[PDB]
Design a protein around this ligand. Structure first.
Ligand SMILES: [Zn+2]
Ligand SMILES: [Zn+2]
Length: 150
């Protein structure tokens, strides 16, 4: 086995015990196992290109100690439209630790709740974080602008 690194926009780095013959889908799956991010929300970038799910790491030049970037899989204050364009709204599904709390209101996230992931990968209740973003388009935790790109 071997190890590779996955970095978010905050500089946070995750270590992944992988195989060279693992699919990008499997990589997103262990990212979900470690950090609870659904694979449909993850866009992995490596060397300035996007990484398709049905392909293997060893297709893509992923040796030991390689670092991929984990961006948000998207298609001053921010208006509601700006917020939707730069974040991932969804209903929460607890995965079978597994507990996550909205750091604004301190309540646990429950199945079905309207939640929002920001491009830094931080996750909140929609109701809690939209009030914040209408005041300042930065993440309350890490202060990353919801429009920053790369
Ligand atoms: Zn909340
Ligand atoms: Zn953040």
């Amino acid at each position: 086995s071997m190890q590779i690194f996955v970095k978010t926009l905050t500089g946070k780095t995750i270590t992944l015990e992988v195989e060279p013959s693992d699919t990008i889908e499997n990589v997103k799956a262990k990212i979900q196992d470690k950090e609870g991010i659904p694979p449909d929300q993850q866009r992995l970038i490596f060397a300035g290109k996007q990484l398709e799910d049905g392909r293997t790491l060893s297709d893509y030049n992923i040796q030991k100690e390689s670092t991929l970037h984990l961006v948000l899989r998207l298609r001053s204050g921010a208006v509601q439209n700006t917020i939707e364009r730069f974040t991932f709204p969804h209903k929460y599904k607890k995965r079978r630790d597994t507990d996550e709390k909205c750091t604004i209101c301190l309540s646990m996230l429950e199945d079905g709740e309207d939640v929002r992931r920001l491009p830094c990968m931080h996750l909140f209740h929609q109701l809690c974080v939209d009030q914040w973003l209408a005041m300042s388009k930065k993440c309350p935790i890490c202060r990353v602008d919801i429009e920053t790109q790369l």
